[PDB]
Amino acid sequence: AQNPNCNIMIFHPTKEEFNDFDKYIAYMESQGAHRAGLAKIIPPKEWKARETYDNISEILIATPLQQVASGRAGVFTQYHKKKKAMTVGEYRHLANSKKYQTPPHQNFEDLERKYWKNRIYNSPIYGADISGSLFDENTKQWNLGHLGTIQDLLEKECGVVIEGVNTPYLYFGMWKTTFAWHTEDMDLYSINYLHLGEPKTWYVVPPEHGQRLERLARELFPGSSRGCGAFLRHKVALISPTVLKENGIPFNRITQEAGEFMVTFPYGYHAGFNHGFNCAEAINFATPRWIDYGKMASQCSCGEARVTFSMDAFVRILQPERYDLWKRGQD
Numbered sequence: 001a002q003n004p005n006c007n008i009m010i011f012h013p014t015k016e017e018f019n020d021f022d023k024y025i026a027y028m029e030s031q032g033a034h035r036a037g038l039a040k041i042i043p044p045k046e047w048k049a050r051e052t053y054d055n056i057s058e059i060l061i062a063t064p065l066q067q068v069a070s071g072r073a074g075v076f077t078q079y080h081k082k083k084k085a086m087t088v089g090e091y092r093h094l095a096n097s098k099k100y101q102t103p104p105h106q107n108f109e110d111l112e113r114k115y116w117k118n119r120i121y122n123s124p125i126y127g128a129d130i131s132g133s134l135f136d137e138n139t140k141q142w143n144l145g146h147l148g149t150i151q152d153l154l155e156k157e158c159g160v161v162i163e164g165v166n167t168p169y170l171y172f173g174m175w176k177t178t179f180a181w182h183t184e185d186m187d188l189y190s191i192n193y194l195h196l197g198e199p200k201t202w203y204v205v206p207p208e209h210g211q212r213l214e215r216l217a218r219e220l221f222p223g224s225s226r227g228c229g230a231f232l233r234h235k236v237a238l239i240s241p242t243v244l245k246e247n248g249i250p251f252n253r254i255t256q257e258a259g260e261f262m263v264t265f266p267y268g269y270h271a272g273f274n275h276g277f278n279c280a281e282a283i284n285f286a287t288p289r290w291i292d293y294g295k296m297a298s299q300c301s302c303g304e305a306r307v308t309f310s311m312d313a314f315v316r317i318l319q320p321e322r323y324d325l326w327k328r329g330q331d
C-alpha cells in the first residue's frame with residue numbers, strides 16, 4: 001500500500017505531464033496521494049494562469065461575509081453576517097487597514113500560533129463563493145474553467161444523462177478568514193488554485209479516518225449534533241490542531257502559497273485560514289473512483305446546508321432512497 005501513514009504529498013509535474021489532467025490525478029493516486037485527503041501540485045516553471053493580476057480591482061464582491069465566532073479559542077463556530085457590496089479594490093484596501101491586516105510575525109508557525117490564540121476575538125470579512133474565473137482563456141493546462149464536468153463523468157461511468165452545470169468560484173480572503181471543517185458536496189474532489197497574495201494554511205483528516213473526526217465533532221458540538229445527523233455540512237464548526245491532538249484524531253497540515261494548486265480527495269475533511277489579502281479559485285470535480293463515495297455521502301436534511309441546483313441530480317441518481325427526504329430539506 002502506497003503512502004500508508006497518509007502524509008500530504010507534493011508533486012512537481014513537468015510541462016509534458018501537465019497536459020492531461022485526468023491522467024495526472026490518476027498518477028497521484030497510484031502513488032497513494034489520496035490517502036492524505038489533500039495534495040499540493042506545484043505547476044511547471046513554464047506555466048502561468050494568466051499574464052498579470054493588474055486589472056482585477058473592479059470585480060464586485062456582492063455579499064462580503066463577516067465571520068463572527070462563538071465558543072472557545074480551540075472549539076468554536078462561526079456565522080456569516082452579510083455586508084454591503086464592495087469591489088476587490090475596496091476589499092484589498094480594507095484587508096490592508098490597521099483593523100484587519102496581518103500582525104507582525106516571525107514565520108508561518110508563529111502566525112499559526114497567533115491565529116489559534118486570537119481568531120475568536122476578531123470578525124474578518126471574506127469574499128467567498130463568487131462565480132467566475134481568473135484563468136486566461138488561452139491557458140490550456142489545468143484551467144479550472146475548462147475541466148470536464150461532473151455531469152459528463154457520471155454519464156460516462158453510469159450511462160445516465162443529467163441536467164446541471166459545474167463552474168468555478170473565486171474567494172477573496174484576508175487575515176483570519178476561515179474555512180470550517182468540511183468535506184465537499186457529495187464527497188467530491190476539489191481543486192484550488194491560489195492566484196495571488198498571502199498564503200493559505202490547510203488542515204486535513206485522512207479519508208479512512210473521517211468518521212473519527214465526525215465522532216469528536218458530535219461530542220464537541222452536542223446541540224448541533226442533535227439538530228442534524230450531518231451538521232458538518234453546515235460549514236460552521238472549527239476545531240484546532242491542539243484539540244485534535246488531545247483527542248487522538250489523525251490529521252496533517254500544510255501551507256499553500258501563491259502559484260500552487262491544492263487537491264482535496266473524496267471524503268477528506270479539511271479546514272484552514274488565510275494569512276492576509278489573497279485570491280483563490282476552486283471547483284469541484286469527479287473521477288471514476290469518486291462514484292462509490294458519491295453513493296455513500298451523508299446529507300444534511302435539517303434544511304441548513306442549502307446547496308446548488310446541480311446537487312439534485314447527484315442525489316436523485318446515486319441516492320434514490322435519500323432523495324425524497326433530502327429534497328424536503330431543500331424545499
Ligand SMILES: O=C(O)CNC(=O)C(=O)O
Nearest residue numbers: 171179190191192280282
Ligand atoms: O479556500 C477556501 O476558503 C475554501 N476552499 C475549499 O474548501 C476547497 O477548495 O475545497
Ligand SMILES: [Mg+2]
Nearest residue numbers: 056057058059
Ligand atoms: Mg476588474
Ligand code: NI
Nearest residue numbers: 183184190264
Ligand atoms: Ni473544500
Ligand SMILES: [Zn+2]
Nearest residue numbers: 228300302304
Ligand atoms: Zn443540517
